[PDB]
């Protein structure tokens, strides 16, 4: 019933993501020199290094705030490359499933703890 | 005053186009397996290999017929990729300028010759 426990849980989940091969395209900002039309499609770029930095700086007040930035990584991936036959679409689907499976217990534990406070 | 002169002029202009790096995406038909939404946007596909073949077979009666097929290559390019920041948009603009500058004297020489006949 610890309202601070999510911070270190999310730190370890991001460490696991950076170790997964499927995360490689999402570890740093999309390269706008390589893809100069990216900003015509995408409003707000996002990547796992930015999420990890935002957490480390204590600029997330809750794990749901962190989830909003992660959702944007997968929203942007689909918007720029929607082809279901592409390598990046299949990498996005597997890493999204991996994130959702591990974050679910972090969110429900946090919600339980918050009721008590 | 030669009404046949345009045939060899257009053959040499196509040779110059095929040697320009900007022509690479337009040298053969768009791959409809790689771009399966292409025919949802594009009514009549066209490429420089088809134009060269049509000329060689003597199926153009005038240089204006050849010119309108080449203009369709640039109409299709802009319709499928309109982003002004894309590499293909800037390649299209430069190659189109090059073609128009060389075809103008082929058309005016032919029109002069035709008046005489």
């Amino acid at each position: 019933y610890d309202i601070q426990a999510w911070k270190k849980q999310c730190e370890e989940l991001l460490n696991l993501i950076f170790q997964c091969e499927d995360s490689e395209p999402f570890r740093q900002p999309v390269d706008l020199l390589e893809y100069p039309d990216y900003r015509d499609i995408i409003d707000t770029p996002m990547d796992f290094a930015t999420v990890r930095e935002t957490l480390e700086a204590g600029n997330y007040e809750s794990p749901m705030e962190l989830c909003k930035d992660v959702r944007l990584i997968f929203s942007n991936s689909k918007a720029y490359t929607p082809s279901k036959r592409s390598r990046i679409y299949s990498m996005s689907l597997r890493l999204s499933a991996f994130f959702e499976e591990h974050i679910s217990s972090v969110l429900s534990d946090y919600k339980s703890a918050l009721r008590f406070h | 005053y030669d009404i046949q002169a345009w045939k060899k002029q257009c053959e040499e202009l196509l040779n110059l186009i095929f040697q320009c790096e900007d022509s690479e995406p337009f040298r053969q038909p768009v791959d409809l397996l790689e771009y399966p939404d292409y025919r949802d946007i594009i009514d009549t596909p066209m490429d420089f290999a088809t134009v060269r073949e049509t000329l060689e077979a003597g199926n153009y009666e005038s240089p204006m017929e050849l010119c309108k097929d080449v203009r369709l290559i640039f109409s299709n390019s802009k319709a499928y990729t309109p982003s002004k920041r894309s590499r293909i948009y800037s390649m299209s603009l430069r190659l189109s300028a090059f073609f128009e500058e060389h075809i103008s004297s082929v058309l005016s020489d032919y029109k002069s010759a035709l008046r005489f006949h």
């Binding site: 893809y35 490359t81 929607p82 082809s83 592409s86 | 990729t81 894309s86």
Partner: peptide, 8 residues
């Protein structure tokens, strides 16, 4: 992708 844009 989005025309001759996107990643593959």
């Amino acid at each position: 992708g989005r025309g001759k844009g996107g990643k593959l």
